[PDB]
Design an enzyme around this catalytic site. Structure first.
Site, short mmCIF file in Angstrom:
data_model
loop_
_atom_site.label_atom_id
_atom_site.label_comp_id
_atom_site.label_asym_id
_atom_site.label_seq_id
_atom_site.Cartn_x
_atom_site.Cartn_y
_atom_site.Cartn_z
N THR A 116 51.90 14.67 20.39
CA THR A 116 50.97 13.57 20.71
C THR A 116 50.85 12.55 19.58
OG1 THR A 116 49.19 15.06 20.04
CG2 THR A 116 49.55 14.75 22.40
N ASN A 117 50.80 13.05 18.35
CA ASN A 117 50.67 12.20 17.16
C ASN A 117 51.71 12.60 16.09
OD1 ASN A 117 47.90 11.32 18.25
ND2 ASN A 117 47.49 13.45 17.78
N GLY A 197 47.57 23.39 20.52
CA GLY A 197 46.73 23.99 21.57
C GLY A 197 45.94 25.22 21.15
N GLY A 215 40.50 22.80 17.54
CA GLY A 215 40.13 23.17 18.90
C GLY A 215 40.38 21.99 19.81
N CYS A 248 42.64 13.54 19.80
CA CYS A 248 41.66 14.57 20.22
C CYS A 248 40.19 14.15 20.10
CB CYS A 248 41.88 15.88 19.43
SG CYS A 248 41.85 15.71 17.63
N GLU A 338 39.24 18.61 28.50
CA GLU A 338 40.05 17.62 27.76
C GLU A 338 41.26 17.06 28.53
OE1 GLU A 338 43.57 19.34 25.07
OE2 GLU A 338 42.02 18.23 24.01
N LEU A 417 41.54 17.84 12.47
CA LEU A 417 40.09 17.81 12.55
C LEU A 417 39.63 19.21 12.85
CD1 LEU A 417 39.62 14.46 14.67
CD2 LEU A 417 39.95 14.72 12.17
#
Ligand SMILES: [Cl-]
Ligand SMILES: [Cl-]
Lengths: 454, 454
Positions: A116-117, A197, A215, A248, A338, A417
């Site tokens: 994703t990043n 994940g 998370g 996220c 999410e 994070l």
């Protein structure tokens, strides 16, 4: 020849090379380390466009122009925070307690890289690991492999130019679960930076190696009665639509009060949001929630039009997010979970106390320890949220995605994070160099045995 | 349910469930209310110092009654005096310049693993620090110290509850099983593991799926450098190494001297009650200490010089305080180069401080890295070299090893859980306390827009 065996071999090779490369870093002074760190920053930043385009094309995720800003953030913004931090050798000499403190690098860091990043997380993890005197071996997601490999190639070459030993910054070229398993479990792996994940984080905490895990982000954005509606709606769209919602810390729901409900719906619409009809909401909900209870990966980092088409929807061409009204919370309620996509749930509470209770209920089922946003001018309500919301970062009058990583706030600039103990993690920090070294303390005797038994 | 393993699993789930509820009640209490309970625990622990020391001495067969009373005093009075005025609950910081507030968030339900070597003192200390940070705690007792641990738990629990603490916040498994302790570590509602015990135990904790903080084996050399005061260096090493017959992990395991100082050091060790073994006696004791599976003999742990001498078939003077074997080698097959939790020392001779350093690193890298090393020296330059280079988390200067490493004779954080950090396979190098048992939640206000960072 067999792919998993080659991958396991390569991992063992990279860790060994990285272990000896770190011993060489450990011998370096703070000035020598900072020379390396600045060179990684510059190469990361100079290649911001190429790597952003590479990642977007390989993954099919996001918006390349937004990935550029992620690369700028991962490079310059992280550099500016970390550049003057003391992270190497003698830190403190307390001449009254007679305790000296010395920074000890962890050793080899195992960095797991999300699809994703990808390029931004590589740059960020490299800067902070090298800054603390560590070597880093990366575990790339199979579908961002080439982007990550070129990010590592570019930044390791610039570091090595500036004095960094070869092998201190490396990456798996053969992504396998077996290979990543070995990287995690290896005796000579000191810590795992586990950005991925919930099964991947749980694996990292079951590996035998100290792990620093994340998370799911399931962050509600409560717009409280006293918020400027235009600014709040702007902040949320800025974040939710950033790189098609890949971060996220982006909003997963909007909570409104009864007094502002329609004023907020109208403002979302005015700034380009599309509200799903009840029928359109269940149709997309059926598509988002898979039969096993997993969330559909097919939405991750995709455009509003892309997602509408997958779901059998026909949605306006200039629609910026899909919004669905939601009343419940649960594992069978996809809007309450999410959605790394420009899709938001939309909840109504009668009062701020009802909104607090609903947020707790959302966060407790999914997203506890991560992120919550509040838009408000009420100092008393913000403080109540601050003392009660089960998150590690509570964002006030700011875009979620950007506020949570410390782009638009004065939080530590980070793409890892931590979700803290409530999320099953060992840290709640926005991860930086201070998470990646130990303190050795050197203490002189102050009392005798005769003093302590008297 | 009648089978022992299944009764034990059941118990642990019940204990965690009660601790879960009780912590939510602790989580609503102010700093004042928490500190009231903490003080009641400290008082009850201190008052039962003789009772609990005698129980542990009789049950385990380890140590010296007198010395265990001091450990009970340390765990109660000394820990309490360090923690009483610390801010650990609720809003900690309000930075108005950065617009970032910080709030302490309790981890939740702590899993405390209690070794038979320091059993009552460890319970008192872990309880005080967990409760101080707003957590509940459920203990896993070493089966050889079950009764003493249970009674420590019973005593401090009742005083806590009388002070306002919820029932079930402080508990202990009553049936020790490996299946029960596995359940304690692996459980979803368990937030953290304080992993005090053997190497297989701490590796188990980092494989549990739950955040862990582990200890390592203590194998600390004591380098009496040539500038040292020998009579005091000898007194310190003896004070620590004979304390509770050597059960504390921060106590010395070898003496390293320079050649020019060797005669003087041996003579002083002799004057103060040390008995140097002959080559044949050292070989005889070495065969007894090292088991054929590669482990060290538990029969020596916390036992007197005479007791060990009898076990090994040695004849040793009645006034001998420690047994010292000259050593030249380091390795798994060399019992003196390893952790002997008993009044037994290795004795090495080096030529220079540089050689003493290299030898110390060689010792530690085989066994003891991350824990403790002790140096006696009046040379601040040599000490600084040791400070920057020796792979330990606590380096003790001019102090008894056992007593300095725990923070009883030093200004280190007073603790009976001594983290070994990454080099020893742990998440922390700290002498751990309250600040390792809460997460920080940060509440941050937007200071920038998307446009600003563009
Ligand atoms: Cl990226
Ligand atoms: Cl004890």
């Amino acid at each position: 020849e067999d792919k998993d065996l080659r991958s396991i071999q390569e991992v063992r090779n990279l860790i060994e090379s990285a272990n000896k490369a770190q011993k060489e870093l450990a011998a370096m002074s703070q000035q020598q380390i900072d020379t390396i760190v600045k060179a990684i920053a510059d190469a990361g930043y100079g290649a911001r466009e190429k790597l952003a385009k590479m990642a977007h094309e390989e993954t099919g995720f996001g918006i390349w122009q937004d990935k550029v800003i992620k690369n700028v953030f991962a490079s310059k913004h992280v550099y500016n925070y970390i550049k003057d931090m003391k992270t190497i050798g003698m830190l403190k000499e307390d001449n009254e307690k007679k305790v000296m403190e010395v920074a000890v690098p962890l050793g080899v860091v195992a960095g797991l890289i999300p699809s994703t990043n990808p390029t931004s997380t590589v740059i960020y993890k490299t800067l902070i690991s090298i800054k603390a005197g560590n070597s880093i071996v990366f575990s790339p997601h199979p579908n961002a492999l080439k982007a990550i490999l070129e990010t590592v190639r570019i930044i390791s070459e610039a570091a090595e130019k500036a004095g960094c030993p070869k092998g201190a910054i490396s990456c798996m070229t053969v992504p396998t679960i077996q290979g990543t398993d070995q990287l995690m479990k290896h005796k000579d792996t000191a810590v795992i930076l586990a950005t991925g994940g919930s099964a991947m984080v749980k694996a990292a905490y079951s590996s035998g190696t100290p792990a620093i895990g994340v998370g799911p982000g399931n962050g509600p954005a409560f717009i409280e009665r006293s918020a400027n509606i235009p600014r709040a709606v702007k902040h949320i769209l800025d974040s939710k639509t950033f790189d098609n919602g890949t971060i996220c810390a982006s909003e997963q729901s909007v909570v409104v009060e009864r007094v502002n409900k329609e004023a907020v719906i109208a403002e979302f619409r005015k700034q380009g949001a599309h509200f799903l009809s009840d029928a359109e909401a269940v149709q997309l909900g059926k598509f988002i929630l898979r039969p096993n209870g997993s969330m559909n990966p097919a939405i991750v980092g995709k455009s509003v039009q892309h997602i509408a088409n997958l779901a059998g929807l026909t949605v306006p061409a200039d629609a910026r997010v899909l919004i669905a009204e939601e009343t419940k919370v649960g594992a069978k309620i996809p809007y309450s979970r999410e959605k790394l996509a420009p899709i938001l749930a939309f909840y109504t509470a009668e009062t701020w106390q009802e909104a607090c209770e609903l947020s707790m209920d959302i966060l407790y089922h999914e997203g506890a320890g991560h992120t919550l946003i509040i838009h408000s001018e009420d100092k008393e309500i913000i403080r109540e949220f601050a003392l009660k919301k089960p998150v590690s970062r509570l964002l006030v009058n700011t875009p979620g995605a950007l506020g949570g990583i410390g782009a638009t706030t004065n939080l530590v600039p980070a793409l890892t994070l931590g979700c803290g103990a409530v999320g099953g993690s060992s840290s709640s920090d926005n991860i930086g160099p201070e998470n990646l070294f130990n303190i050795r303390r050197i203490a002189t005797g102050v009392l005798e045995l005769e003093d302590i038994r008297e």
